[PDB]
Symmetry: D3
Subunit: 149 residues, 6 copies
Amino acid sequence: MEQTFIMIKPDGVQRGLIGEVICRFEKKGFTLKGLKLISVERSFAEKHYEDLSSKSFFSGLVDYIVSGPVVAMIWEGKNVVLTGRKIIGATNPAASEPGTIRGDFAIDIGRNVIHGSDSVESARKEIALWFPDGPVNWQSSVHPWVYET
Amino acid sequence: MEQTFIMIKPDGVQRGLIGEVICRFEKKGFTLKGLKLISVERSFAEKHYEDLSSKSFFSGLVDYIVSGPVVAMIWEGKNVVLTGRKIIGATNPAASEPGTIRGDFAIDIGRNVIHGSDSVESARKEIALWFPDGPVNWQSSVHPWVYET
Amino acid sequence: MEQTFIMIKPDGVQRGLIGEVICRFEKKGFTLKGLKLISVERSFAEKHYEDLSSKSFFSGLVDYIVSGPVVAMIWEGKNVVLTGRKIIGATNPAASEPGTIRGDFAIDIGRNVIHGSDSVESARKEIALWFPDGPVNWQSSVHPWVYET
Amino acid sequence: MEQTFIMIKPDGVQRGLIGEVICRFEKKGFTLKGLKLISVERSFAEKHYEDLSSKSFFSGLVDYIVSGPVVAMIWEGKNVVLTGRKIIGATNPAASEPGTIRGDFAIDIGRNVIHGSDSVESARKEIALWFPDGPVNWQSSVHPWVYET
Amino acid sequence: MEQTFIMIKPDGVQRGLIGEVICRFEKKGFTLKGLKLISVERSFAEKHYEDLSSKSFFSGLVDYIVSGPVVAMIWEGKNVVLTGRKIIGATNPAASEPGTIRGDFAIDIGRNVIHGSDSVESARKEIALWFPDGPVNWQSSVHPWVYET
Amino acid sequence: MEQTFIMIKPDGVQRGLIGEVICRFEKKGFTLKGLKLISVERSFAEKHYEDLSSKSFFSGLVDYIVSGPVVAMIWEGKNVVLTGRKIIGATNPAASEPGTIRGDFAIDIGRNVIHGSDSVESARKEIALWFPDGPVNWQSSVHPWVYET
């Protein structure tokens, strides 16, 4: 029942990796509770990167996340946050293993295709910011076959 | 260019086919201009199937489309409507060709997995209804290689 | 909710196409009720092709079908018999369309990878011959999403 | 050459992973020597989890493998046992790396999709119990390209 | 056995469709006998399109295949010419059926990803033009399972 | 930018993995600047394996490199040398991880399917030997999304 935030960055969308990303999370057995294609404003990007406002690269991170539309999502499942980080792969694309998203598609650390919350409380902040209206709640009929009880 | 409305139906989401559907349209060269996971409310449904409100099965469609979340989408490109219909395949899953979304995943007419605007006219109507705020604009960097001139 | 008989011919096994074949029926929404790797013997083969005892090439069919192990299957679902033939493609690989099993892998009539019941009649009969013990029953948790009512 | 027993648990069948699982072993270069869909008997089950007779969770493992039909298999090759478990992934889905069967599909340790022999000795026992009548033998024509000499 | 000439156009290379193409012919069972990545010269281009020199769109063809590298190939197998054509799909993307290369990735008639000889005769000319040094010969170890005797 | 030499060995070609391989490097974002099907001559082969002269299996490797055609390539991008190797996987298939080329298809050390430059140094050497005419230059239109600046 845990939830994490997953976002396909501008390059992920430009490189036509949207469907592929979602397939990984779907096959794994997680539940999509949020999804949308959106372009970010300056104010939002900065707030999303708030915890870095005082960094050399801050201005860059904003310019980029706004240089194109992105796909925001909410994924729910046991250990979805850590599992999600595992599926995505190492932050530095050169260290990510084949089989992970960044491992199979990313090369440059600045065009690392996607983002995933780093922690549970981190996913909470991220989800509230990106999904003010809340989650889309539904139950999967395959659920008794993905979990015990 | 032209735009069409594609909607992954409740059974499409439950069967974890979201990613796959998107993949095909992405591979064809179309650009996504709208995307959202939605929980349809009775009244909204009735407007969507409004052109059929006179059929003896109207309420049936309403009961179903509201039985679970769906994924709304806007796809753009030349002939996007016709191709969209072609990619989806025939209405009757019994006549739908392998290679099409319905031919590969659907069996029952009442669980056809996906919806596609049947005409350009019904398209503009559908995307206006489902996406009030209009489309998310962007330019595929591979445009010069998908379209001539 | 009829059943049909699909058999991956010796060549299908040699070429490592067992998983692929099984995947297409699984994704279509069909239920496997019978599965087994077996190497057929002379007499049983003559009874399978029994309907062609009066053909010159009859001797060869039996010869071939026995040259290596095959995979016998029982698949269940609406129109599974007719849909199965669609999924398999034309008898002559030269006519089988891309997207169908023979369309994607088969080249020679003699090496056509698979066999499928050509009719509900042939079906209920082949199924009894190959699977004398009957089928293995179970129901898909996503059944209400693949079928109506 | 070496042999291992791989079994697709009831949750693996329900989730439509049969083809997927087989594809991976076929592509690796391994030979399939046994395959069948079985609905396990309680007494058969208790013998399968025999060495766990003492553990508290014994009845749980037994009630479960009986709850749905499974797919039993025999695969042959060099280090097929160790590669088999490597291909499968960490016992606890929380650790299983993307690229492995459990890594891409499993979430709950109780619904870990598949089983593989932990050793050569236990495989001998496993194949002898699940495939009393021995394996279906054949020689791959690509063998001389998978193995040297 | 019969041979044909397939060429991935500049847009195909740009859109990263090289491997996908080869996969389709490999999985069909055909044998690759020639493979080169080339940046075609103006004069060579005019030669390849000689049979069309007085045609109104001649300059377009020339300007086009010269705008970016291409992948030239030789494929061998029974009915490889007509089949290669069936794999590529309708010349007009708008008509190409899902499952074919153009059906899956093309949209604009002038950016249709691939070229395939349309006759055994034309194939010999094109093969003699693109690979004057002849094909790279070799037998496949799965040949006996692709063809009869 | 940096470039490396990848070679799909005879077994790799015989098992029909050419497309598959090219796909992994393509999806990663790397640029193919050289590609070809070649039946290597004894003398050339002997140069390629220079450093292993003093060794014993030397002659063995040579005999093998000439026993069947191969596919030579040049791939360009940041860290393409070590990444190419990370994609290929451990030399010993028993150690190669699922997700990597050898991890997914190799079994025997002698049929490791592929070869990749071990360093930028050897890479420069290998590239010169196999591609004396230089590379084929072009700029992916996706470049700005694969690299920041």
